[PDB]
């Protein structure tokens, strides 16, 4: 009968993070703006449940700089809220993803995206 804590990271309910695995609890374990974060992720549409993107399929971690528009909005908001080794499932509304256009065949316009994101490490 266990149910998981989902936290709204925006006021419009367009970024809702369900934590599947809690990270580490220290301040040292919290990533700052401009830090290079290393993540693994799986991206699937909410409706179809179809994987459009996975760093796990690739077997290569994804690296970016937090809080700098290197990734879709929802990622910058979601990763900013994570700590080292936190695993999560973030639900992203259209405007926190690829918007009215979507992206390629795999992401239609106005798609709700669900990403499972594990914060492996970070650094300056």
């Amino acid at each position: 009968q266990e149910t998981l804590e989902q936290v709204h990271l925006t006021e419009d309910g367009g970024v809702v993070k369900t934590i599947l695995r809690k990270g580490e609890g220290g301040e040292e374990n919290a990533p700052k703006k401009g830090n290079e974060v290393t993540v693994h992720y799986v991206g699937k549409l909410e409706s179809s449940g179809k994987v459009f993107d996975s760093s796990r399929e690739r077997n290569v971690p994804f690296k970016f700089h937090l809080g700098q528009g290197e990734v879709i909005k929802g990622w910058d908001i979601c990763v900013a809220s994570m700590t080292k080794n936190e695993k999560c499932s973030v639900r992203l509304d259209s405007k926190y993803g690829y918007g009215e256009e979507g992206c390629g065949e795999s992401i239609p316009g106005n798609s709700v995206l669900i990403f499972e994101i594990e914060l492996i490490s970070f650094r300056e």
Partner: peptide, 4 residues
């Protein structure tokens, strides 16, 4: 693309 722009961005991921």
């Amino acid at each position: 693309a722009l961005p991921f």
